[PDB]
Amino acid sequence: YSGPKLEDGKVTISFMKELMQWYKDQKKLHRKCAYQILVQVKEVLSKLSTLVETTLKETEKITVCGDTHGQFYDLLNIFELNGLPSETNPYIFNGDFVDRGSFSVEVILTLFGFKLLYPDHFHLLRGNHETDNMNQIYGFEGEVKAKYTAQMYELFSEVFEWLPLAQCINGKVLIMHGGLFSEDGVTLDDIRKIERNRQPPDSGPMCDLLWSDPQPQNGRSISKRGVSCQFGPDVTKAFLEENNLDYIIRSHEVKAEGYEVAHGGRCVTVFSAPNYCDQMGNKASYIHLQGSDLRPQFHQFTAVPHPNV
Structure with missing residues (x-):
């Protein structure tokens, strides 16, 4: 019997390496592990506000990623090639983890496991696809029900209810x-x-x-949904000047080349979603920021075909 084991309430390197090989065997973890991991992330996150003041020195480097949509195999390849994650190498993902992802639940639960490993070194912000409105009706709820039961679903929902914004x-x-x-x-x-x-x-x-x-x-373009619309560039430039920002690099906008400098050149959009829905097969990239290199550092990787599972 290969039942679960908790060690001092601390998730250790050997144990989630064993968990990675277990998931390569593609089996199901026992439900009590879900119980303790869910409660632990519940207390650790419920004390966290939308905005938490975290200071990173020029000697620390931070890794940020674009829209990944639960590419678990690519995350394993990152762990394999880019080296073992470190306290001095925090990872941040720019939302959109779920929807159109068939096993993003394993991704999110191993992310909670890593949060248990690094509760003050892994941070995320709520994406716009992690909403019950589209997940319940447009098949994501069906995916959850096919995977597991409704009680765990509402547990993940109530956990997500404390997700930060800025x-x-x-x-x-x-x-x-x-x-x-x-x-x-x-x-x-x-x-x-x-x-x-x-x-x-x-x-x-x-x-x-x-x-x-x-x-x-420039200008003000009406939202095709018929409600509200995308505000004009005067607001954006005023907020850029007031909040002493130079520019930002984000995603959720489609670019043919995988990246673009737009908005009059004041914003950078990067597409790190390779072959999303098996459509574009574009290059992906993740960005390292540190004091020793004032310009953002770009590592460009490409995806591989995955078994039809």
Whole structure:
């Protein structure tokens, strides 16, 4: 019998290497492990706010990634080639982990495991696809039900209800996926004073926070959904000047070349989603930021075909 083992409540390197080989054997972990890992991430995250002040020195390097959509095999290849993860090499992913992903649940649970390994060195921000509105109706709920039972589903939902929105790094970098409201007067405090462990909203400006994205052209383009629309470049430039940001590199916008410098050249969009839905097969890349190299560092990797499982 190869039953579970907890060691001092601490997830150790040998143990999740054993877990990686177990998942290469493609079996199912016993439900009590799910119980303790879920409760532990529950207390460790529930104490974490939307904005937590974390300072990273010029001697520390940080790894950030684009839209991956649960490429678990590519993550294993990263662990294999890029070296063992370190306290001085935090990894951050720019949302969009789920939907169109058939085993992103294993990805997210091993991410919670790594959070147990590094509770103050792995941080993520809520994406716009991690919402029950589209997950319940458009097949992701069916995927969850095929995988597991409804009680664990509501457990993951209530865990996700505390997901943060915005981060500040180095006092020079501001991190978010969606963006801003359509109107001026946006502070960090108003979002901070909004209690987020409640019923998720359907739409509106709070939905604009994670879905409204700027456009490379100027002006104000009406949203094709018929509700609200993407706010103009005057707001963006005013906020750029006020919040002392130079530029940001993000994703969730389709580029033929896999990257582009747009918005009058003031923003960088990178496509690190290789062959999403088996369509583009574009190059992927992840970015290292550190004090010793002021320009962002780019590592470009490519994906491989995966078994039809």
